[PDB]
Amino acid sequence: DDFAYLNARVRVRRGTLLKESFFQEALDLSFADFLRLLSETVYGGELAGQGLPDVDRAVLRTQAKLVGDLPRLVTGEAREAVRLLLLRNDLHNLQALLRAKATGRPFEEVLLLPGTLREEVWRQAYEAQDPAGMAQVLAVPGHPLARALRAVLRETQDLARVEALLAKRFFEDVAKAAKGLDQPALRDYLALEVDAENLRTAFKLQGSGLAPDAFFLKGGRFVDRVRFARLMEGDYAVLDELSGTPFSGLSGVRDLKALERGLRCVLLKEAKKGVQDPLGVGLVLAYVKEREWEAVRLRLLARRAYFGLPRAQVEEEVVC
Amino acid sequence: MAVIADPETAQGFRLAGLEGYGASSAEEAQSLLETLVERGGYALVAVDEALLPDPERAVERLMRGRDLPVLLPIAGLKEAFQGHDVEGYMRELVRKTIGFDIKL
Amino acid sequence: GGLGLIKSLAEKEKQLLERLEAAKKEAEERVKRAEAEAKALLE
Amino acid sequence: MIAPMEKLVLAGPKGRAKELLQSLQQAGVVHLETLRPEALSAYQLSPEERAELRRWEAVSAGAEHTLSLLGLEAEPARPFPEGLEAAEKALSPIQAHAEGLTRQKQELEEELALAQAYLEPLERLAALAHGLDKSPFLRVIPFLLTEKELPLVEEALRKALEDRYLLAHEAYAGGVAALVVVHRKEVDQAKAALSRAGVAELRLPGALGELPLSEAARRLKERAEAAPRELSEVRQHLAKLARESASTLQSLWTRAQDEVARLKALEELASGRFGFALLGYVPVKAKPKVEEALARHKESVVYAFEPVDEHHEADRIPVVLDNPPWAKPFELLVSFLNTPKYGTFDPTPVVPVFFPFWFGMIVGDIGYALLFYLVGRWLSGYVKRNEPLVIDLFALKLKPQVIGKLVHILNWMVFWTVVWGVIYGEFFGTFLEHLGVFGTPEHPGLIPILIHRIDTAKTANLLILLSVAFGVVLVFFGLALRAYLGLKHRHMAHFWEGVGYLGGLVGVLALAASYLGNLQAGWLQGLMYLGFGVFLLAVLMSRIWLMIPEIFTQAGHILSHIRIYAVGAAGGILAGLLTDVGFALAERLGLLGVLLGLLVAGVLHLLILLLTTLGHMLQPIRLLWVEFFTKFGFYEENGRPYRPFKSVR
């Protein structure tokens, strides 16, 4: 409820962040220098041993320690708001769970990264006869995925098209809840994420020839459904049509790698606008996205040091 | 099919829909090689160069006949900054094959 | 006591496993008798 | 009161265990127990038993999906004793016919929908396609588009073959079917330019957007002419199969659920190495039925019914109500809460003792009482109809047992309600304005009112005193139950705490009625001093620091009982105001619109009843659950209930 008592610990955690020189000096290391610098870092407090997998497990434990508590320590409308910040890992865990239930591998098959609800609920959801019964076992009150999967659950028993339509309805109900809050910037950031995901589905499905209206979603403000069909066709001018919006530098690109790189750049730049709101909740969302950019930078530098990457090989990864 | 290089390498192949294994030591690489040879896997096995250079040994000891799990000394990615020295591999191959190394 | 009834079940299962072990053991004791009789008959 | 609920075990052989488990599931009157620890095996049944159980479970799942695709619901009934493969064979043919009919129905419905979506458009476009059907020189760009913005695409047509590209939109005014035709490749480029201007091709699914337009129109017209009789016959054969096989499917589902429950219960056994044991709990009242079930074991392989534990440490003890026949109906309201700690005070009797009394004190409208009586007659006719009460938008599905308990509780409420309404003297509100049945000294028409209640100058302090006395009595009963339970469990903390809270409340009431009340504080000064001394002495003997906050909270819980008199006075004043307004506007305003004025006043009274009486009744049970439970605790670990073997039947 209190968007300030959490904001104080948010400012404290914002005080615990690495500078750009911490990665700029990390452009030249040999994973032992990187291990020593991470040993200086707070994320190396869970530093178990040596090796890339130990480094990634320590990074996941540090992310759970510094980022997982934000889902806790709050109650009310602020809890309903801050729940829809670290939601991608939860939807990914639910998607892997649906894939495992439809596939047939072991319930300990996927590694089940940390999200919002109890992992014991995810273990208990491995055994459920009805999909609606599994949804009710996974039903939290303010979980948007619980309301999304139940509404999408009135089609069949367990289908992959049900899973894709459930992801579409998940993004749709996320946009509906983002419109259904008293937050001036969280709705804008969620809508920017929705339009970027629409562009990402368009670039991933460009040339597929499928139905774009079945692929296009609702909730954005930066593009059009006709612009969506133009992006579905081989027309980069629609990507050039993005002028004045946050999709500014996204122009003249056809390769999806640098396209989604600049998309993440625009998303992080919009997330940088969250420091303007010291009283609401978007500052905490900015802190979460900052830890996310730090996490991408950490696993990137970890891969670079473990495989000996060139500085030119990852030069397009720290430009913003 | 199947490959063995490294868990970080093998998870890309498992993402291809292709059976992966991964061993840090060369003896464990022949162990996993022996595993998929005894569990005769669809006839192809790729092996990284860094673990086994010429991995013919397990199949010539075990499956001397039938030529079936085809071996490949594939290149590893931390070494694929160099690019295997493909010409030197080919020289080594013809010298192994017909004995007589010459210049192409 | 219920687990004292489990103990009476332990006496009964010692009788059951006794019939089992005496059967599958006494059969090889009869194997001994059979090979004794037939090897002496062959000689 | 809760029963003895003794524990029990038995043992024998494993097939003897399966037979005795089938009997004790047929005699399903005992909750089970794990009893995993010592001198026994895990009693993992068999892989063959696991396979037969998976087969029966899949059979039950298939019967459930068959009822779902049939639309019917799982109603329990007497089962069908049959073989597993035989029941599977009985299931498979009806399930196959149903699955094929359901797929055919879904396919024909989607086909008729897609046919009706573009029927006349395809026919008009085919009539326009009388000059290039499959001509190998020019494509046919079709676009069933919006209203006549034909110049916006005609700009791209001017970018196309200029004195050519035959392009017009004829008819079917839901969408202008703009047909353009120039070439093949230049027309592909022009279709790209028009889609850049905004255009779409008539791409139907299946074969209609995949075959020639004349053939697609013929197939769509054939499907449109054929789909209605096919859908009607599909619904008819589906309903015929449902009405022909639902009883067999239900008996199969009942037998399958029974066998599957027997299999799941077989997972809870306790083997004895080619021999097996089992244990659990059951009430003492069915011990003769327990023995009658025990006779069916082979030599009645011995069942031992050992006694339950004491007030210490009975948590896996089963829970049951076991109320009187007068007290049987009151359990339904108590069921909304949790269960006791197996020796706790069953307060279910005080619920029927007091909740109807406070409810009758609340509502005193004899006309609303007769309305409740007529509504109970309607509900009783629904119960005699023996149909489960189904309320769609209320989602209220009710078996007749709960409805009959509700009706019995309603009659028991209405008796004391009419009693207290005669005590208040109000028939459908104040009928004494019109027909002076109540008697006051102001205008004596008929029999006097015990509580006049329109005047508070003589009645309000008496009503407040009555509410306060009932509340203090219930508070005394609850604290006494707390202290008696603390004595019964031999934990002096709770009993001494109840004693200290009771003494503090007594001293508080004494000091209140002395200082803030009347004069003559000599008889109660030592009383207040003794209550304060009892509170301080139990504070020393308790040392819990359960402070004057706890005492003041108990005091507010005691003093909250006047809300009963408050809501009764509120509803009475509202009913009297509405009745006086209606009687005045009818009789004194004309004496001719008595039908219209009486009907409008009765409709407003019905609206006020529908807006008020629910919460008015709710406040008594709220006070009951908030006082009688809370002083006695009733919020400790919730108990474990009697979950015997089901045998759903």
PDB file of C-alpha atoms in Angstrom, chain D residues 16-29 262 289 292-297 645 647:
ATOM      1  CA  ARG D  16      -8.164 -60.733   2.896  1.00  0.00           C
ATOM      2  CA  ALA D  17      -7.155 -57.076   3.183  1.00  0.00           C
ATOM      3  CA  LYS D  18      -8.563 -56.314  -0.276  1.00  0.00           C
ATOM      4  CA  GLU D  19     -11.840 -58.062   0.569  1.00  0.00           C
ATOM      5  CA  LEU D  20     -12.098 -56.354   3.962  1.00  0.00           C
ATOM      6  CA  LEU D  21     -11.299 -53.025   2.322  1.00  0.00           C
ATOM      7  CA  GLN D  22     -14.110 -53.588  -0.178  1.00  0.00           C
ATOM      8  CA  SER D  23     -16.441 -54.382   2.723  1.00  0.00           C
ATOM      9  CA  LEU D  24     -15.300 -51.436   4.861  1.00  0.00           C
ATOM     10  CA  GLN D  25     -15.746 -49.198   1.839  1.00  0.00           C
ATOM     11  CA  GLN D  26     -19.208 -50.670   1.389  1.00  0.00           C
ATOM     12  CA  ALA D  27     -19.407 -50.014   5.126  1.00  0.00           C
ATOM     13  CA  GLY D  28     -17.685 -46.668   4.735  1.00  0.00           C
ATOM     14  CA  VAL D  29     -18.106 -45.302   8.255  1.00  0.00           C
ATOM     15  CA  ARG D 262     -11.111 -48.498  -3.396  1.00  0.00           C
ATOM     16  CA  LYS D 289     -22.268 -51.386  12.551  1.00  0.00           C
ATOM     17  CA  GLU D 292     -21.467 -56.048  11.651  1.00  0.00           C
ATOM     18  CA  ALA D 293     -18.923 -55.062   9.021  1.00  0.00           C
ATOM     19  CA  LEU D 294     -16.246 -56.949  10.969  1.00  0.00           C
ATOM     20  CA  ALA D 295     -18.187 -60.224  10.738  1.00  0.00           C
ATOM     21  CA  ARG D 296     -17.657 -60.327   6.963  1.00  0.00           C
ATOM     22  CA  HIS D 297     -13.915 -60.831   7.437  1.00  0.00           C
ATOM     23  CA  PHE D 645     -14.776 -44.141   3.059  1.00  0.00           C
ATOM     24  CA  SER D 647     -19.081 -44.961  -1.473  1.00  0.00           C
TER      25      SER D 647
END
